Amino acid sequence: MKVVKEFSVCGGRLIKLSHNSNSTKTSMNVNIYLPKHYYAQRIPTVFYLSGLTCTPDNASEKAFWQFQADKYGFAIVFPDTSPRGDEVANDPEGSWDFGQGAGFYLNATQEPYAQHYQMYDYIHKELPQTLDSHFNKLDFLDNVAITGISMGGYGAICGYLKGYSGKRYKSCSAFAPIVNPSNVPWGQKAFKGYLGWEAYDPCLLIKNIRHVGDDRILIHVGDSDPFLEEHLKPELLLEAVKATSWQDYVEIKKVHGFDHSYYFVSTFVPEHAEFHARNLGLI
Amino acid sequence: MKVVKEFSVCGGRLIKLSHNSNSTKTSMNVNIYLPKHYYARIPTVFYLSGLTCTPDNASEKAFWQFQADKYGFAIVFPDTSPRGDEVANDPEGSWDFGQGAGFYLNATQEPYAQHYQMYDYIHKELPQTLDSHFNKLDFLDNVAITGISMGGYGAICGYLKGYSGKRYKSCSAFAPIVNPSNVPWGQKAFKGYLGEWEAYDPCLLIKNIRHVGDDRILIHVGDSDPFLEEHLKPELLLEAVKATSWQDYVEIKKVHGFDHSYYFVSTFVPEHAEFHARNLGLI
């Protein structure tokens, strides 16, 4: 990887990285915050997945994970949301809910997009291996957390479930996530375009997975989220876990007056960082 | 004063406001964060933004809200100039003069004179407009002033000019311009807005102001700020006070590896909040 820029934040550094992805067939950007602990004298990683239209920079500047990262001793990674570029396909109608900035963390089967949109392998296979091979003391592969907002919240929950049998992720949280893509408009549009569905829908995945021990999924969502009722409906995961071993282990905190914005995100970042800090065995 | 939009942040709210200003003869946007305490004499901090910025940049990237909740203060984020097709702009299209770039002066030079009464806007008009619309918050008596770059300049300047009447009770700045008469952006601003100066330059102003008590200006600046050597030159304020009673009451903390970015601001917002909280008598 190439170091594009370095910003000192808190007692550590935010590092803007770029590399040539074999998953996406393109140059990809990613930011990582290294905690004060890395520069002192293994540090686990949280992966934060971003929402529609977002770059790595958005969450990095607006969420203030860095303070929590120094508080508990974790690194945090902010990947991009799609392949980018002139030779990369985009939404044919110019919409922002599909195409560049809108991969939905899927491995594209459908022909035009299939060439670049291999976003599942990017996030879960290639990127952590690129980071480990670059920086390596940082654990990018074993002791790992996953989180995200909206589209990103989906990807986090999805990744946690699919990898659950191999304990791929040691904790999962989400902010205002899409829980049932098969049944929301952005989700449908995504699956149609990228795929042409079940192995990628959490509300279906969670039925077939035997819950373990104390494991749970922390969810936060605001009741003044303008997309809640039509596009998010995090509550349908609560329906899907009724009469399952996961019943009582998805807790959705519906929080009063809050938005879809990074004002909402930044508010509950501390509580989430704690949740992950616990599950990574840091406190 | 019209409410443009509210957002719940931490245990309070940030409100994007707009009003018709007498100072500027224009509609102006202001963001204010009301802490947990106002929904449970609340003092107010005014944060002045740098070149090109709107009230939004600081609101989203500095994370004052957690601190405002912590100590019990309101914080106000005014805009940096009048705005609009009718309001004069830089004749060459530069970002350091004109729109986004009022330098907190009361302009005398003719085109800009119709609109750019930014010193009046900030110190005379706005806190009174806020006091009408909201009022107990204190927008007038127990108030602190701070800012970044152009805004840091504004904060020091406002603090000093009213120092004898105790206009503001606490002053700090992040990477300010301290000596506009000798840095390119300031020289351009003065020529452009006023023609001919002294009454707006802190380095000249401080020569004639009787220091008292343990009053002091806290300044942070990063040694990796690319604007340091040419445009800012805070140390000039330190040498300025060598002649005066202010000797030992301006402290510049030049911190290693830090930027001009809001990664820099957010890092030291916590200390600056404590500084103000102490001066406002909240702790």
From Swiss-Prot, chain A:
NCBIfam families: fghA_ester_D. Belongs to the esterase D family. GO terms for molecular function: carboxylic ester hydrolase activity; metal ion binding; S-formylglutathione hydrolase activity. It is an enzyme of class 3 (hydrolase). SUPFAM superfamilies: alpha/beta-Hydrolases. It holds the Pfam family Esterase. Optimum pH is 7. It catalyses: S-formylglutathione + H2O = formate + glutathione + H(+). This is S-formylglutathione hydrolase. The active site is at S150 (charge relay system), D225 (charge relay system), H260 (charge relay system). InterPro entries: AB_hydrolase_fold, Esterase-like, S-formylglutathione_hydrol. It comes from the Eukaryota. Its main location: cytoplasm. One of its GO terms (biological process) is formaldehyde catabolic process. Monomer.
